Amino acid sequence: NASICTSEEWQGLMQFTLPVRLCKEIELFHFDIGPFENMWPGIFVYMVHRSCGTSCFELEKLCRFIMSVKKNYRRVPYHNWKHAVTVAHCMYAILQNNHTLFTDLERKGLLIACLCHDLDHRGFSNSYLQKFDHPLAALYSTSTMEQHHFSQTVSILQLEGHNIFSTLSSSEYEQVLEIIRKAIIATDLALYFGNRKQLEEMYQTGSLNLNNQSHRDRVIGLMMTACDLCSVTKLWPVTKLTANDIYAEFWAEGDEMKKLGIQPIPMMDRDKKDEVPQGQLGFYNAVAIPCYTTLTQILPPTEPLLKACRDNLQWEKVIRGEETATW
Amino acid sequence: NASICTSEEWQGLMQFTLPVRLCKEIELFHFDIGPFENMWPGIFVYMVHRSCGTSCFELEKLCRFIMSVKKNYRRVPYHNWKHAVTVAHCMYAILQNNHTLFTDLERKGLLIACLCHDLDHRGFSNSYLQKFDHPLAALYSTSTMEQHHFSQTVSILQLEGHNIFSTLSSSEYEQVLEIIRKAIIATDLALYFGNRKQLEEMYQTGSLNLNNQSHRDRVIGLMMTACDLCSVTKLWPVTKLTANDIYAEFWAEGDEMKKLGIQPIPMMDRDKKDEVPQGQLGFYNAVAIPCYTTLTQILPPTEPLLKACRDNLSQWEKVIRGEE
Ligand SMILES: CC(=O)Nc1nc2ccccc2c(=O)[nH]1
Ligand SMILES: [Mg+2]
Ligand SMILES: [Mg+2]
Ligand SMILES: [Zn+2]
Ligand SMILES: [Zn+2]
What's the per-residue H, E or C state across chain B? CCCCCCHHHHHHHHCCCCCHHHCCHHHCCCCCCCCCHHHHHHHHHHHHHHHHCCCCCCHHHHHHHHHHHHHCCCCCCCCCHHHHHHHHHHHHHHHHHCCCCCCHHHHHHHHHHHHHCCCCCCCCCHHHHCCCCCHHHHHCCCCHHHHHHHHHHHHHHCCCCCCCCCCCCHHHHHHHHHHHHHHHHCCCHHHHHHHHHHHHHHHHHCCCCCCCHHHHHHHHHHHHHHHHCHHHHCCHHHHHHHCCHHHHHHHHHHHHHHCCCCCCCHHHCCCCCCCHHHHHHHHHHHHHHHHHHHHHHHCHHHHHHHHHHHHHHHHHHHHHCCCC
Q: How far A273 CA sits from the closest chain B CA (Å)?
A: 19
Q: Which technique was used to obtain these atomic coordinates?
A: X-ray
Nearest CA in chain A to B266: A322
A99 is catalytic: no
Rounded Cα distance, A46 and A175, in Å: 24
Rounded Cα distance, A32 and A316, in Å: 23
**Number of Cβ atoms within 10 Å of the Cβ of B70:** 20
Rounded Cα distance, B274 and A325, in Å: 12
Rounded Cα distance, A111 and A107, in Å: 6
Which residue's alpha carbon is nearest to atom 12 within ligand 1? A229
Which residue's alpha carbon is nearest to atom 2 within ligand 1? A283
Resolution in A: 1.9
Rounded to 5 degrees, φ, ψ at B237 are -60, -25
Instruction: Check if the beta carbon of residue B232 is closer than 8 Å to that of residue B240.
Output: no
The total number of residues shown for chain A amounts to: 327
| Secondary structure (DSSP) of A42-105 | HHHHHHHHHHH-TTSS-HHHHHHHHHHHHHTS-S-SSSSHHHHHHHHHHHHHHHHHTGGGS-HH
The total number of residues shown for chain B amounts to: 324
Q: Which of A92, A77, A71 is nearest to A18 (CA)?
A: A92
Mutation test of ligand 1: which of A192, A241, A283 has the most ligand atoms closer than 8 Å to its C-beta? Answer: A283
Q: Which of B181, B219, B220 is nearest to B200 (CA)?
A: B219
Residue type at A41 in one-letter notation: P
Residue type at B40 in one-letter notation: W
Of B278, B289, B313, the CB nearest to A324: B278
CATH number of the domain encompassing residue A103: 1.10.1300.10
Q: Inspect the interface and report whether the beta carbons of A35 and B320 lie closer than 8 Å.
A: no
Instruction: Check if the beta carbon of residue B218 is closer than 8 Å to that of residue B147.
Output: no
CA-CA distances (angstroms) from residue B90 to A123, B73, B94, B232, B234? 41, 19, 6, 11, 10
The catalytic site residues of B sit at 79
Radius of gyration for chain A, computed over Cα atoms and rounded to the nearest angstrom: 19
Instruction: Check if the beta carbon of residue A73 is closer than 8 Å to that of residue A51.
Output: no
- Whether ligand 1 lies within 6 angstroms of the CB of A227 is answered as no
CA-CA distances (angstroms) from residue B77 to B81, B82, B246, B252? 10, 10, 11, 10
- Kindly give the distance from the C-alpha atom of residue A323 to the centroid of ligand 2, in angstroms, as a whole number: 30
Find all residues with CB under 8 Å of B276, minimum gap 6, and list them: B243, B244, B247
Residues after which chain A is broken (C–N above 2.5 A) are 313
- Whether ligand 1 lies within 6 angstroms of the CB of A246 is answered as yes
Q: Write out chain B residues lying below 8 Å of A323, CB-based.
A: 266-267
**Number of Cβ atoms within 10 Å of the Cβ of B274:** 8
Rounded Cα distance, B186 and B137, in Å: 18
- Whether ligand 1 lies within 6 angstroms of the CB of A232 is answered as yes
Q: How many Cα atoms within 13 Å fall on the side-chain side of residue B137?
A: 11
Bind-site residues of A for a divalent metal cation: 83, 117-118, 228
Q: Which of B152, B160, B149 is nearest to B60 (CA)?
A: B160
Which residue's alpha carbon is nearest to atom 1 within ligand 1? A279
A326: helix, strand or coil: coil
Q: How far is CA A285 from its chain centroid?
A: 20
Domain of residue B71, residue span:
1-324
Of A36, A37, A324, the CB nearest to B279: A324
CA triple B44-B47-B52, angle to 5 deg: 120
Rounded Cα distance, B273 and A45, in Å: 41
The ligand 1 atom at the shortest distance from the C-alpha of residue A189 is 14
Q: How far B120 CA sits from the closest chain A CA (Å)?
A: 24
Instruction: Check if the beta carbon of residue A123 is closer than 8 Å to that of residue A249.
Output: yes
A118-129: b (≥16 Cβ within 10 Å) or e? bbbbebbbbebb
Q: How far A264 CA sits from the closest chain B CA (Å)?
A: 29
Q: Inspect the interface and report whether the beta carbons of A35 and B266 lie closer than 8 Å.
A: no
Nearest CA in chain B to A325: B267
Rounded Cα distance, B134 and B139, in Å: 9
Domain count, chain A: 1
Instruction: Check if the beta carbon of residue B145 is closer than 8 Å to that of residue B121.
Output: yes
- Whether ligand 1 lies within 6 angstroms of the CB of A87 is answered as no
Q: What is the 3-state secondary structure (H, E, C) of A219-243?
A: HHHHHHHHHHCHHHHCCHHHHHHHH
Rounded Cα distance, B176 and B57, in Å: 14
* Dihedral sign (CA B235, B240, B241, B246): positive
CA-CA distances (angstroms) from residue A190 to A198, A201, A287, A307? 14, 19, 11, 25
Instruction: Check if the beta carbon of residue A165 is closer than 8 Å to that of residue A48.
Output: no
CA-CA distances (angstroms) from residue A124 to A47, A182, A227, A249, A288? 30, 21, 20, 8, 21
CA triple B152-B156-B162, angle to 5 deg: 160
Rounded Cα distance, B88 and A118, in Å: 46
- Whether ligand 1 lies within 6 angstroms of the CB of A267 is answered as yes
As to burial, measured by CB atoms within 10 angstroms (0-12 exposed, 13-18 middle, 19+ buried), residue A138 is exposed
Residues after which chain B is broken (C–N above 2.5 A) are none
A265: helix, strand or coil: coil
Q: What does the CA dihedral A165, A168, A171, A177 come to, rounded to 10 degrees?
A: -20
Q: How far is CA A114 from its chain centroid?
A: 5
Q: Which of A150, A93, A17 is nearest to A303 (CA)?
A: A93
Instruction: Check if the beta carbon of residue B252 is closer than 8 Å to that of residue B128.
Output: yes
* Dihedral sign (CA A34, A39, A40, A43): negative
